[PDB]
């Protein structure tokens, strides 16, 4: 006998059996459920059916308690070996048998995770993981969800078509207590195959998302994915055409959103998935909906950072957010409140006042102050693992998750000087260099088209035509055109451009 769910019992046989008319309506007259002391229960079962191959019996009960036994009442006349017409009745065992919880499906969610649902609340000893049977090696396995969601932490590698099944020597896993029924493998049933499913999610921009995959895909359908293909496979709170475009590379499914990111949504695979599949040939395994009832949450993260001065940083956020502390809505937080929350890669935050502020709570930018002028290129801003005050949307919205960000310098320490009617000399704070997209040094040259993608000189609303950039060491020289309006005028301004990708610090 076996228990494959919270209300199910599957009982197996060794020789094809048969059923007599009315056997679906007289289940209690064939089987009987005992307790550990031999005292039979009172009418435990409700309905029953027999499989076509005749070696399987299905029952539904709600009266099962741990360490209960089963057996066939001897005198029973409604179950016949090899035929209801002519055979004898199916015998009974000298001693009853113990129900043993089973397992029937598992998901490989990420490269290092395999979640296995369990039928009922369970108990385990430590986190050693030899009670299973896997081809690959494992490092750790531990319980969760009140004992109803096993987790297997892969250490080796996943080969397509692998199967998970418990061992017959099990001495670690049990049902409902440390002294309950031992999980056992079903006799005659094949080892269950592992199916893939989507992993974690992260918002990286007001429109982009990144999704972890269980293994490196090689050939979706179509190979170059499309907006139509992705809409038919994934679901985002049931919105119509929630998707703008989608690409796959490595173990990441990069993505775009139809409109602005609305805090709250979740992601799960639709029922009719046909596009995203893992493997090649007849071994292809389609992605399935996850076991967890709540769909995977969308974790907001930092978008980008830049230092407006040596002791100020203005982080940009993907959507409206707000600090929440002790049930109230707040705009900023004092040092110790922001200190176990976000940490610069080197240094410490300000002492007195709001060390981390947003002005109006429902905003999109975050201002940080340090212990003086201590920012130098090569410093990063991150959200720490243990944090709860950061929440996007409302008083109970999603909390931010760790992600490293690099700060772009945006401060000029010294003034900018016009030495001639067509010359402007800009003194940069740190040693610099011109490099290419692929990283090869560009030396000290910059063309007119390449010099308009780095900086601009403007008067009022209009800009000024350029002729050449230049940079040797820490002085960056610029030359205008020189005719009509491309000359120095009575009050002008200089600005770096956010499109800049050629000039590095």
Tab-separated table of C-alpha atoms in Angstrom:
chain	number	residue	atom	x	y	z
A	1	UNK	CA	0.000	0.000	0.000
A	2	UNK	CA	1.040	3.603	-0.597
A	3	UNK	CA	-0.026	7.198	0.015
A	4	UNK	CA	0.526	9.525	-2.944
A	5	UNK	CA	-1.363	12.618	-1.725
A	6	UNK	CA	-3.144	14.171	1.249
A	7	UNK	CA	-6.248	11.991	0.764
A	8	UNK	CA	-5.190	9.149	-1.562
A	9	UNK	CA	-4.140	5.527	-1.139
A	10	UNK	CA	-2.785	3.443	-4.027
A	11	UNK	CA	-2.553	-0.312	-3.428
A	12	UNK	CA	-0.559	-2.523	-5.782
A	13	UNK	CA	-0.933	-6.168	-6.804
A	14	UNK	CA	1.193	-8.920	-8.331
A	15	UNK	CA	-1.313	-10.803	-10.524
A	16	UNK	CA	-4.157	-9.331	-12.543
A	17	UNK	CA	-7.376	-9.210	-10.514
A	18	UNK	CA	-11.027	-8.590	-11.329
A	19	UNK	CA	-14.054	-6.714	-10.016
A	20	UNK	CA	-17.671	-7.790	-9.612
A	21	UNK	CA	-20.641	-5.528	-10.295
A	22	UNK	CA	-21.129	-3.014	-7.503
A	23	UNK	CA	-17.469	-3.082	-6.456
A	24	UNK	CA	-17.284	0.697	-6.866
A	25	UNK	CA	-19.991	0.939	-4.179
A	26	UNK	CA	-18.742	-1.596	-1.595
A	27	UNK	CA	-15.142	-0.552	-0.920
A	28	UNK	CA	-15.347	-1.064	2.848
A	29	UNK	CA	-16.346	-4.708	2.275
A	30	UNK	CA	-12.962	-5.673	0.746
A	31	UNK	CA	-10.223	-3.622	2.442
A	32	UNK	CA	-9.963	-2.457	6.046
A	33	UNK	CA	-7.751	0.174	7.684
A	34	UNK	CA	-6.268	-0.720	11.079
A	35	UNK	CA	-4.251	1.268	13.602
A	36	UNK	CA	-0.928	0.398	15.221
A	37	UNK	CA	-2.669	-1.686	17.918
A	38	UNK	CA	-4.810	-3.741	15.516
A	39	UNK	CA	-8.085	-1.946	16.295
A	40	UNK	CA	-9.954	-1.517	13.013
A	41	UNK	CA	-11.398	1.883	12.166
A	42	UNK	CA	-15.062	2.491	11.321
A	43	UNK	CA	-15.947	2.915	7.637
A	44	UNK	CA	-12.817	4.876	6.642
A	45	UNK	CA	-13.108	4.684	2.854
A	46	UNK	CA	-15.500	6.376	0.429
A	47	UNK	CA	-14.937	5.111	-3.129
A	48	UNK	CA	-12.628	2.872	-5.127
A	49	UNK	CA	-11.678	1.913	-8.677
A	50	UNK	CA	-9.407	-0.593	-10.427
A	51	UNK	CA	-6.933	0.060	-13.232
A	52	UNK	CA	-7.203	-1.455	-16.698
A	53	UNK	CA	-4.006	-3.473	-16.261
A	54	UNK	CA	-5.573	-4.754	-13.032
A	55	UNK	CA	-2.441	-4.367	-10.880
A	56	UNK	CA	-3.500	-1.055	-9.293
A	57	UNK	CA	-6.189	-0.101	-6.770
A	58	UNK	CA	-7.274	3.471	-6.028
A	59	UNK	CA	-9.033	4.561	-2.831
A	60	UNK	CA	-10.006	7.884	-1.266
A	61	UNK	CA	-9.899	8.323	2.506
A	62	UNK	CA	-9.881	11.173	5.008
A	63	UNK	CA	-9.361	9.086	8.168
A	64	UNK	CA	-5.709	8.114	7.668
A	65	UNK	CA	-3.419	8.745	10.634
A	66	UNK	CA	0.309	8.133	10.667
A	67	UNK	CA	1.547	4.571	11.231
A	68	UNK	CA	-1.723	2.995	10.049
A	69	UNK	CA	-1.958	-0.435	8.427
A	70	UNK	CA	-4.081	-2.101	5.751
A	71	UNK	CA	-5.200	-5.587	4.751
A	72	UNK	CA	-7.927	-7.389	2.812
A	73	UNK	CA	-10.758	-8.950	4.791
A	74	UNK	CA	-10.352	-12.662	4.150
A	75	UNK	CA	-13.955	-13.707	3.496
A	76	UNK	CA	-14.350	-11.004	0.828
A	77	UNK	CA	-16.014	-12.259	-2.348
A	78	UNK	CA	-15.951	-9.241	-4.687
A	79	UNK	CA	-12.341	-9.384	-5.984
A	80	UNK	CA	-11.272	-12.314	-8.157
A	81	UNK	CA	-7.839	-13.490	-9.307
A	82	UNK	CA	-7.624	-13.470	-13.140
A	83	UNK	CA	-11.392	-13.208	-13.638
A	84	UNK	CA	-14.639	-12.268	-11.932
A	85	UNK	CA	-16.352	-15.175	-13.699
A	86	UNK	CA	-14.263	-18.135	-12.560
A	87	UNK	CA	-11.340	-17.221	-10.287
A	88	UNK	CA	-10.973	-17.426	-6.524
A	89	UNK	CA	-10.934	-14.435	-4.200
A	90	UNK	CA	-7.729	-12.448	-3.794
A	91	UNK	CA	-6.047	-13.621	-0.565
A	92	UNK	CA	-5.004	-11.629	2.485
A	93	UNK	CA	-1.614	-11.349	4.165
A	94	UNK	CA	-0.813	-13.080	7.442
A	95	UNK	CA	-0.013	-9.642	8.882
A	96	UNK	CA	-1.169	-6.216	7.766
A	97	UNK	CA	1.060	-3.759	5.908
A	98	UNK	CA	2.136	-0.213	6.751
A	99	UNK	CA	1.256	2.735	4.527
A	100	UNK	CA	4.353	4.636	3.397
A	101	UNK	CA	4.221	8.137	1.855
A	102	UNK	CA	5.442	8.428	-1.727
A	103	UNK	CA	6.601	11.071	-4.214
A	104	UNK	CA	5.508	11.520	-7.811
A	105	UNK	CA	6.920	14.712	-9.380
A	106	UNK	CA	9.836	17.101	-9.010
A	107	UNK	CA	10.895	20.358	-10.650
A	108	UNK	CA	14.416	21.492	-11.530
A	109	UNK	CA	13.918	25.227	-10.964
A	110	UNK	CA	17.472	26.584	-11.225
A	111	UNK	CA	20.930	25.137	-12.001
A	112	UNK	CA	21.364	24.297	-8.303
A	113	UNK	CA	17.802	23.597	-7.098
A	114	UNK	CA	15.301	20.741	-7.333
A	115	UNK	CA	12.082	21.294	-5.371
A	116	UNK	CA	10.097	18.147	-4.575
A	117	UNK	CA	6.554	18.496	-3.188
A	118	UNK	CA	5.648	16.195	-0.326
A	119	UNK	CA	2.232	14.646	0.341
A	120	UNK	CA	1.859	15.708	3.996
A	121	UNK	CA	3.822	17.376	6.787
A	122	UNK	CA	7.114	15.570	7.318
A	123	UNK	CA	10.224	15.424	9.486
A	124	UNK	CA	13.899	14.894	8.714
A	125	UNK	CA	17.198	14.339	10.519
A	126	UNK	CA	19.802	16.997	9.800
A	127	UNK	CA	20.493	17.893	6.181
A	128	UNK	CA	22.401	14.863	4.874
A	129	UNK	CA	20.873	13.916	1.541
A	130	UNK	CA	21.637	10.231	0.913
A	131	UNK	CA	18.051	9.078	1.501
A	132	UNK	CA	17.342	9.842	-2.175
A	133	UNK	CA	18.696	8.138	-5.298
A	134	UNK	CA	20.210	10.522	-7.854
A	135	UNK	CA	22.856	9.980	-10.502
A	136	UNK	CA	24.465	13.338	-9.748
A	137	UNK	CA	25.979	14.286	-6.403
A	138	UNK	CA	24.331	16.603	-3.886
A	139	UNK	CA	25.684	18.788	-1.086
A	140	UNK	CA	22.671	19.721	1.057
A	141	UNK	CA	18.933	19.074	1.274
A	142	UNK	CA	16.585	20.680	3.800
A	143	UNK	CA	12.888	21.131	4.541
A	144	UNK	CA	10.615	24.179	4.361
A	145	UNK	CA	6.963	25.206	4.052
A	146	UNK	CA	6.119	23.517	7.372
A	147	UNK	CA	7.646	20.255	6.150
A	148	UNK	CA	5.894	20.160	2.762
A	149	UNK	CA	8.505	21.380	0.247
A	150	UNK	CA	11.782	19.477	0.093
A	151	UNK	CA	14.784	21.243	-1.426
A	152	UNK	CA	17.698	19.467	-3.107
A	153	UNK	CA	20.847	21.563	-3.573
A	154	UNK	CA	22.760	20.230	-6.562
A	155	UNK	CA	26.550	20.101	-6.417
A	156	UNK	CA	27.341	18.264	-9.655
A	157	UNK	CA	25.493	18.734	-12.941
A	158	UNK	CA	22.052	18.044	-14.367
A	159	UNK	CA	21.760	15.686	-17.332
A	160	UNK	CA	18.538	15.846	-19.326
A	161	UNK	CA	16.306	12.887	-18.531
A	162	UNK	CA	17.464	12.348	-14.949
A	163	UNK	CA	15.133	10.695	-12.445
A	164	UNK	CA	14.581	11.146	-8.699
A	165	UNK	CA	13.446	8.341	-6.396
A	166	UNK	CA	13.895	7.494	-2.714
A	167	UNK	CA	15.939	4.529	-1.455
A	168	UNK	CA	14.540	1.336	0.052
A	169	UNK	CA	17.068	1.704	2.906
A	170	UNK	CA	15.637	5.055	4.017
A	171	UNK	CA	16.434	5.983	7.616
A	172	UNK	CA	16.160	9.803	7.551
A	173	UNK	CA	12.762	10.902	6.197
A	174	UNK	CA	9.467	10.304	7.980
A	175	UNK	CA	5.822	11.375	8.052
A	176	UNK	CA	4.309	13.860	10.523
A	177	UNK	CA	6.993	13.353	13.206
A	178	UNK	CA	10.495	12.139	13.975
A	179	UNK	CA	8.951	8.709	14.704
A	180	UNK	CA	6.469	8.372	11.830
A	181	UNK	CA	6.175	6.303	8.680
A	182	UNK	CA	9.305	5.914	6.570
A	183	UNK	CA	9.081	7.058	2.967
A	184	UNK	CA	9.371	4.075	0.641
A	185	UNK	CA	9.577	3.529	-3.123
A	186	UNK	CA	6.597	2.231	-5.065
A	187	UNK	CA	7.100	-1.325	-6.294
A	188	UNK	CA	6.996	-1.577	-10.077
A	189	UNK	CA	6.629	2.146	-10.788
A	190	UNK	CA	9.369	3.822	-12.801
A	191	UNK	CA	11.619	6.466	-11.298
A	192	UNK	CA	9.988	9.864	-11.729
A	193	UNK	CA	11.479	12.167	-14.352
A	194	UNK	CA	12.504	15.723	-13.451
A	195	UNK	CA	10.768	18.531	-15.381
A	196	UNK	CA	12.089	22.102	-15.735
A	197	UNK	CA	10.462	25.345	-14.647
A	198	UNK	CA	11.251	29.042	-14.304
A	199	UNK	CA	13.391	30.280	-11.404
A	200	UNK	CA	13.798	33.702	-9.840
A	201	UNK	CA	13.003	37.100	-11.357
A	202	UNK	CA	14.557	40.558	-11.062
A	203	UNK	CA	13.538	44.004	-12.271
A	204	UNK	CA	16.629	45.796	-13.580
A	205	UNK	CA	14.890	48.723	-15.316
A	206	UNK	CA	11.402	50.198	-15.488
A	207	UNK	CA	10.851	47.892	-18.500
A	208	UNK	CA	13.341	44.985	-18.306
A	209	UNK	CA	13.357	41.694	-16.394
A	210	UNK	CA	15.845	38.846	-16.039
A	211	UNK	CA	14.739	35.256	-15.402
A	212	UNK	CA	16.967	32.402	-14.277
A	213	UNK	CA	16.683	29.132	-16.191
A	214	UNK	CA	17.253	25.575	-14.924
A	215	UNK	CA	19.771	24.737	-17.657
A	216	UNK	CA	21.353	26.352	-20.696
A	217	UNK	CA	18.726	26.294	-23.439
A	218	UNK	CA	19.804	25.612	-27.016
A	219	UNK	CA	16.753	25.637	-29.295
A	220	UNK	CA	13.422	27.258	-28.374
A	221	UNK	CA	10.558	27.442	-30.890
A	222	UNK	CA	11.275	29.647	-32.849
A	223	UNK	CA	15.038	29.797	-32.241
A	224	UNK	CA	14.845	33.615	-32.433
A	225	UNK	CA	12.033	34.166	-29.945
A	226	UNK	CA	9.216	36.611	-30.618
A	227	UNK	CA	6.575	38.646	-28.819
A	228	UNK	CA	3.846	36.243	-29.949
A	229	UNK	CA	5.835	33.189	-28.850
A	230	UNK	CA	6.530	34.520	-25.350
A	231	UNK	CA	2.969	35.740	-24.737
A	232	UNK	CA	1.739	32.183	-25.307
A	233	UNK	CA	4.098	30.662	-22.709
A	234	UNK	CA	4.382	32.963	-19.667
A	235	UNK	CA	1.704	34.782	-17.671
A	236	UNK	CA	1.885	38.060	-15.706
A	237	UNK	CA	-1.268	38.519	-13.602
A	238	UNK	CA	-3.358	37.663	-16.659
A	239	UNK	CA	-2.713	40.933	-18.485
A	240	UNK	CA	-3.370	41.117	-22.223
A	241	UNK	CA	-0.158	41.166	-24.277
A	242	UNK	CA	2.045	41.887	-21.237
A	243	UNK	CA	5.222	41.463	-23.253
A	244	UNK	CA	7.126	43.646	-25.722
A	245	UNK	CA	10.019	41.400	-26.804
A	246	UNK	CA	12.102	38.558	-25.434
A	247	UNK	CA	15.539	37.035	-25.975
A	248	UNK	CA	17.401	34.055	-24.524
A	249	UNK	CA	21.141	33.713	-23.953
A	250	UNK	CA	23.081	31.519	-21.562
A	251	UNK	CA	20.938	30.891	-18.489
A	252	UNK	CA	19.119	34.252	-18.692
A	253	UNK	CA	15.877	35.179	-20.461
A	254	UNK	CA	16.145	38.947	-20.946
A	255	UNK	CA	12.865	40.739	-21.457
A	256	UNK	CA	10.849	43.931	-21.947
A	257	UNK	CA	7.419	45.012	-20.679
A	258	UNK	CA	4.511	46.459	-22.644
A	259	UNK	CA	4.008	49.367	-20.219
A	260	UNK	CA	5.570	50.679	-17.027
A	261	UNK	CA	6.265	48.120	-14.313
A	262	UNK	CA	3.295	47.898	-11.932
A	263	UNK	CA	4.394	46.666	-8.476
A	264	UNK	CA	2.659	43.508	-7.309
A	265	UNK	CA	2.563	41.212	-10.325
A	266	UNK	CA	3.887	37.646	-10.388
A	267	UNK	CA	5.123	35.300	-13.110
A	268	UNK	CA	4.064	31.722	-13.868
A	269	UNK	CA	4.032	29.453	-16.912
A	270	UNK	CA	0.728	29.046	-18.738
A	271	UNK	CA	-0.849	25.638	-19.278
A	272	UNK	CA	-0.321	25.541	-23.061
A	273	UNK	CA	3.428	26.246	-23.145
A	274	UNK	CA	4.892	25.201	-26.496
A	275	UNK	CA	7.742	27.653	-27.074
A	276	UNK	CA	10.246	27.233	-24.219
A	277	UNK	CA	11.541	23.669	-23.897
A	278	UNK	CA	14.789	22.148	-22.638
A	279	UNK	CA	16.822	19.646	-24.651
A	280	UNK	CA	16.814	18.385	-28.217
A	281	UNK	CA	15.051	15.617	-30.098
A	282	UNK	CA	12.597	13.216	-28.496
A	283	UNK	CA	14.188	13.945	-25.101
A	284	UNK	CA	12.679	17.449	-25.036
A	285	UNK	CA	11.073	18.328	-21.695
A	286	UNK	CA	8.482	21.102	-21.650
A	287	UNK	CA	8.371	23.713	-18.902
A	288	UNK	CA	5.568	23.150	-16.395
A	289	UNK	CA	3.707	25.348	-13.897
A	290	UNK	CA	5.392	25.429	-10.505
A	291	UNK	CA	4.160	23.609	-7.414
A	292	UNK	CA	4.214	26.637	-5.104
A	293	UNK	CA	0.783	28.246	-4.899
A	294	UNK	CA	2.098	31.857	-4.958
A	295	UNK	CA	3.664	32.696	-8.304
A	296	UNK	CA	7.256	33.907	-8.340
A	297	UNK	CA	7.509	37.513	-7.190
A	298	UNK	CA	9.167	40.335	-9.118
A	299	UNK	CA	12.077	41.639	-7.036
A	300	UNK	CA	12.856	45.334	-7.628
A	301	UNK	CA	16.517	46.338	-7.626
A	302	UNK	CA	18.662	49.415	-8.146
A	303	UNK	CA	18.666	50.754	-11.699
A	304	UNK	CA	21.813	52.901	-11.799
A	305	UNK	CA	23.988	55.068	-9.561
A	306	UNK	CA	26.060	58.200	-10.075
A	307	UNK	CA	27.969	60.474	-7.700
A	308	UNK	CA	26.980	64.137	-8.011
A	309	UNK	CA	29.795	64.998	-5.579
A	310	UNK	CA	32.389	63.312	-3.402
A	311	UNK	CA	29.799	62.787	-0.631
A	312	UNK	CA	26.452	62.457	-2.431
A	313	UNK	CA	24.921	59.607	-4.440
A	314	UNK	CA	21.581	59.623	-6.274
A	315	UNK	CA	20.352	56.081	-6.921
A	316	UNK	CA	17.506	55.727	-9.422
A	317	UNK	CA	14.690	53.244	-8.801
A	318	UNK	CA	12.494	51.336	-11.273
A	319	UNK	CA	9.143	52.555	-9.898
A	320	UNK	CA	7.437	54.357	-7.029
A	321	UNK	CA	8.697	53.233	-3.619
A	322	UNK	CA	8.724	54.265	0.039
A	323	UNK	CA	10.326	53.430	3.371
A	324	UNK	CA	8.136	51.674	5.947
A	325	UNK	CA	9.198	51.370	9.593
A	326	UNK	CA	7.121	50.139	12.539
A	327	UNK	CA	3.955	50.180	10.449
A	328	UNK	CA	4.254	53.860	9.523
A	329	UNK	CA	5.209	55.591	6.285
A	330	UNK	CA	8.539	57.414	6.346
A	331	UNK	CA	10.637	59.415	3.900
A	332	UNK	CA	14.128	58.883	5.340
A	333	UNK	CA	16.062	57.018	7.995
A	334	UNK	CA	18.839	57.758	10.486
A	335	UNK	CA	22.262	56.109	10.200
A	336	UNK	CA	21.644	52.891	12.131
A	337	UNK	CA	18.403	52.441	10.182
A	338	UNK	CA	20.135	52.724	6.788
A	339	UNK	CA	23.331	51.005	7.992
A	340	UNK	CA	22.034	47.417	8.250
A	341	UNK	CA	20.201	48.152	4.997
A	342	UNK	CA	22.568	49.386	2.282
A	343	UNK	CA	26.361	49.544	2.396
A	344	UNK	CA	28.920	51.275	0.216
A	345	UNK	CA	31.775	49.012	-0.824
A	346	UNK	CA	34.058	51.106	1.411
A	347	UNK	CA	33.334	53.649	4.133
A	348	UNK	CA	30.373	54.642	6.274
A	349	UNK	CA	27.297	56.846	6.044
A	350	UNK	CA	26.500	60.212	7.620
A	351	UNK	CA	25.949	60.624	11.346
A	352	UNK	CA	23.205	63.190	11.934
A	353	UNK	CA	20.033	63.491	9.889
A	354	UNK	CA	18.426	61.362	7.231
A	355	UNK	CA	21.307	59.197	6.032
A	356	UNK	CA	19.054	57.915	3.231
A	357	UNK	CA	16.136	60.010	1.971
A	358	UNK	CA	13.541	60.223	-0.809
A	359	UNK	CA	11.818	63.566	-0.023
A	360	UNK	CA	8.186	62.698	-0.835
A	361	UNK	CA	7.815	59.000	-0.080
A	362	UNK	CA	6.237	58.122	-3.450
A	363	UNK	CA	9.286	58.999	-5.542
A	364	UNK	CA	12.033	57.365	-7.600
A	365	UNK	CA	15.414	58.659	-6.344
A	366	UNK	CA	17.490	58.020	-3.230
A	367	UNK	CA	20.095	60.397	-1.787
A	368	UNK	CA	22.944	59.068	0.362
A	369	UNK	CA	25.459	61.026	2.431
A	370	UNK	CA	28.824	59.733	3.624
A	371	UNK	CA	31.372	60.680	6.287
A	372	UNK	CA	32.939	63.397	4.166
A	373	UNK	CA	34.475	63.573	0.707
A	374	UNK	CA	35.461	59.919	0.331
A	375	UNK	CA	34.099	58.729	-3.036
A	376	UNK	CA	36.691	57.605	-5.581
A	377	UNK	CA	36.106	55.710	-8.837
A	378	UNK	CA	35.710	52.015	-8.156
A	379	UNK	CA	32.967	52.176	-5.489
A	380	UNK	CA	29.626	50.392	-5.622
A	381	UNK	CA	26.187	50.591	-4.008
A	382	UNK	CA	24.278	47.459	-3.012
A	383	UNK	CA	21.227	46.323	-1.041
A	384	UNK	CA	22.214	44.039	1.823
A	385	UNK	CA	20.831	40.534	2.236
A	386	UNK	CA	19.067	41.197	5.561
A	387	UNK	CA	16.739	44.136	4.960
A	388	UNK	CA	13.005	44.768	5.274
A	389	UNK	CA	12.442	48.551	5.357
A	390	UNK	CA	12.985	48.870	1.599
A	391	UNK	CA	9.625	48.243	-0.029
A	392	UNK	CA	8.303	49.315	-3.422
A	393	UNK	CA	4.740	50.378	-4.130
A	394	UNK	CA	3.008	50.535	-0.750
A	395	UNK	CA	3.241	49.584	2.923
A	396	UNK	CA	3.272	45.872	1.996
A	397	UNK	CA	4.934	45.778	-1.417
A	398	UNK	CA	7.936	43.769	-2.542
A	399	UNK	CA	11.267	44.244	-0.799
A	400	UNK	CA	14.452	45.027	-2.708
A	401	UNK	CA	17.008	42.279	-3.290
A	402	UNK	CA	20.813	42.418	-3.475
A	403	UNK	CA	22.401	43.530	-6.739
A	404	UNK	CA	25.728	45.289	-7.334
A	405	UNK	CA	25.764	48.689	-9.059
A	406	UNK	CA	28.671	50.789	-10.327
A	407	UNK	CA	28.682	54.549	-9.776
A	408	UNK	CA	29.424	56.840	-12.710
A	409	UNK	CA	31.459	59.922	-11.721
A	410	UNK	CA	29.449	63.086	-12.290
A	411	UNK	CA	31.432	65.766	-10.432
A	412	UNK	CA	33.963	68.272	-11.747
A	413	UNK	CA	36.293	69.454	-8.993
A	414	UNK	CA	37.764	72.392	-10.929
A	415	UNK	CA	36.293	75.095	-13.121
A	416	UNK	CA	36.094	74.997	-16.923
A	417	UNK	CA	38.081	77.660	-18.781
A	418	UNK	CA	37.662	79.155	-22.265
A	419	UNK	CA	41.198	79.955	-23.420
A	420	UNK	CA	40.266	81.056	-26.958
A	421	UNK	CA	37.229	81.849	-29.131
A	422	UNK	CA	37.053	78.137	-30.011
A	423	UNK	CA	38.826	76.331	-27.129
A	424	UNK	CA	37.458	74.910	-23.870
A	425	UNK	CA	39.742	73.088	-21.424
A	426	UNK	CA	38.142	70.734	-18.888
A	427	UNK	CA	40.191	69.413	-15.965
A	428	UNK	CA	38.964	65.978	-14.988
A	429	UNK	CA	39.162	64.715	-11.398
A	430	UNK	CA	41.041	61.439	-11.988
A	431	UNK	CA	43.413	59.928	-14.523
A	432	UNK	CA	41.393	58.991	-17.585
A	433	UNK	CA	41.569	57.255	-20.958
A	434	UNK	CA	39.772	56.771	-24.276
A	435	UNK	CA	38.816	53.170	-25.038
A	436	UNK	CA	36.741	51.313	-27.603
A	437	UNK	CA	33.629	49.186	-27.224
A	438	UNK	CA	35.814	46.066	-27.386
A	439	UNK	CA	38.339	47.673	-25.016
A	440	UNK	CA	41.158	48.492	-27.437
A	441	UNK	CA	42.776	51.828	-26.635
A	442	UNK	CA	41.808	54.710	-28.915
A	443	UNK	CA	44.836	56.757	-27.832
A	444	UNK	CA	44.102	60.494	-27.830
A	445	UNK	CA	41.851	60.953	-30.874
A	446	UNK	CA	38.137	61.678	-31.187
A	447	UNK	CA	36.175	62.622	-34.298
A	448	UNK	CA	33.362	65.140	-34.656
A	449	UNK	CA	30.695	62.424	-34.623
A	450	UNK	CA	32.400	60.655	-31.709
A	451	UNK	CA	32.811	63.945	-29.810
A	452	UNK	CA	29.085	64.780	-29.851
A	453	UNK	CA	28.269	61.497	-28.067
A	454	UNK	CA	30.409	62.435	-25.034
A	455	UNK	CA	29.862	66.121	-24.242
A	456	UNK	CA	27.999	69.243	-25.311
A	457	UNK	CA	28.556	73.002	-25.160
A	458	UNK	CA	25.381	75.052	-25.295
A	459	UNK	CA	23.890	78.510	-24.856
A	460	UNK	CA	20.288	78.788	-23.763
A	461	UNK	CA	18.481	75.911	-25.450
A	462	UNK	CA	20.735	75.487	-28.500
A	463	UNK	CA	23.939	73.457	-28.716
A	464	UNK	CA	27.222	74.294	-30.463
A	465	UNK	CA	28.800	72.550	-33.418
A	466	UNK	CA	32.066	70.767	-32.706
A	467	UNK	CA	35.209	69.910	-34.646
A	468	UNK	CA	37.412	67.755	-32.390
A	469	UNK	CA	37.719	66.246	-28.927
A	470	UNK	CA	41.057	65.462	-27.279
A	471	UNK	CA	42.439	64.138	-24.005
A	472	UNK	CA	45.995	63.596	-22.746
A	473	UNK	CA	46.277	62.634	-19.089
A	474	UNK	CA	43.724	64.600	-17.064
A	475	UNK	CA	43.084	67.565	-19.396
A	476	UNK	CA	40.327	67.245	-22.002
A	477	UNK	CA	40.511	69.854	-24.759
A	478	UNK	CA	37.617	70.676	-27.087
A	479	UNK	CA	37.501	72.693	-30.314
A	480	UNK	CA	34.378	74.215	-31.856
A	481	UNK	CA	33.729	75.029	-35.525
A	482	UNK	CA	34.493	78.762	-35.491
A	483	UNK	CA	31.990	80.271	-37.960
A	484	UNK	CA	28.868	82.304	-37.183
A	485	UNK	CA	27.498	80.689	-34.023
A	486	UNK	CA	30.002	77.941	-33.114
A	487	UNK	CA	32.143	80.303	-31.021
A	488	UNK	CA	32.303	81.243	-27.357
A	489	UNK	CA	29.469	83.614	-26.418
A	490	UNK	CA	28.336	85.685	-23.451
A	491	UNK	CA	27.535	83.018	-20.882
A	492	UNK	CA	27.688	79.364	-21.905
A	493	UNK	CA	27.649	75.963	-20.268
A	494	UNK	CA	29.289	72.557	-20.446
A	495	UNK	CA	27.689	69.180	-19.835
A	496	UNK	CA	28.594	65.528	-20.073
A	497	UNK	CA	26.052	63.406	-21.939
A	498	UNK	CA	24.332	60.366	-20.447
A	499	UNK	CA	24.874	58.639	-23.808
A	500	UNK	CA	28.631	58.693	-23.191
A	501	UNK	CA	30.431	55.365	-23.467
A	502	UNK	CA	33.879	56.339	-24.811
A	503	UNK	CA	35.398	58.370	-21.942
A	504	UNK	CA	36.341	56.402	-18.823
A	505	UNK	CA	37.588	57.318	-15.346
